Amino acid sequence: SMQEEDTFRELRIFLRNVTHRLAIDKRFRVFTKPVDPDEVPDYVTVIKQPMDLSSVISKIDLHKYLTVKDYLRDIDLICSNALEYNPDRDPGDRLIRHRACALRDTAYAIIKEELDEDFEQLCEEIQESR
Ligand SMILES: CC(=O)N[C@H](C(=O)NCCCBr)C(C)C
Ligand SMILES: [Cl-]
């Protein structure tokens, strides 16, 4: 229905605003664009589902997220990809793991404070009815 289309529209506006707030934070610059295969030719070979905040915006706009839970699965991938690709004890890998964890925690904290649980439940029920 048009009411349901309005609900998904509101979801996309909410997700674009959360994603923009993560993207303008200086800590998260490394996550704003895909890993360039130049610098890192093995990346695409180790990480099977690369994810970054530009990809998340593209997905919002393609109507790929019908719930906040689906969007958080992709935020979780940004975190878990960095834990998997940069697991060593040296400071460069610890810094990216801490930043990727902080991204994830920040997205979850904004959603805890600003997503109404009844709005999420509505999205879940429309998605399940399709
Ligand atoms: C997203 C990611 O894991 N990036 C790794 C990383 O530590 N970069 C940090 C920053 C500088 Br441009 C890289 C080894 C592929
Ligand atoms: Cl830095």
Swiss-Prot record:
Places the protein is found: Nucleus
Function: May be a transcriptional coactivator of the nuclear receptor ESR1 required to induce the expression of a subset of estradiol target genes, such as CCND1, MYC and E2F1. May play a role in the recruitment or occupancy of CREBBP at some ESR1 target gene promoters. May be required for histone hyperacetylation. Involved in the estrogen-induced cell proliferation and cell cycle progression of breast cancer cells.
Family: Belongs to the AAA ATPase family.
Expression triggers: Up-regulated in breast, uterus, colon, ovary, and stomach tumors. Induced in breast cancer cells overexpressing NCOA3 or treated with estrogen. Down-regulated in 5-fluorouracil-resistant derivatives of the colon cancer cell line HCT 116.
Domain called Bromo: residue spans: 3-114
Gene: ATAD2
UniProt tissue specificity: Highly expressed in estrogen receptor positive breast tumors and in osteosarcoma tumors.
Protein name: ATPase family AAA domain-containing protein 2
Organism: Homo sapiens (Human)
Assembly behavior: Interacts with ESR1 and NCOA3 and these interactions are enhanced by estradiol. Interacts with acetylated lysine residues on histone H1.4, H2A, H2B and H3 (in vitro).
Coiled-coil regions listed in the entry: 108-130
Disulphide-bonded residues: none
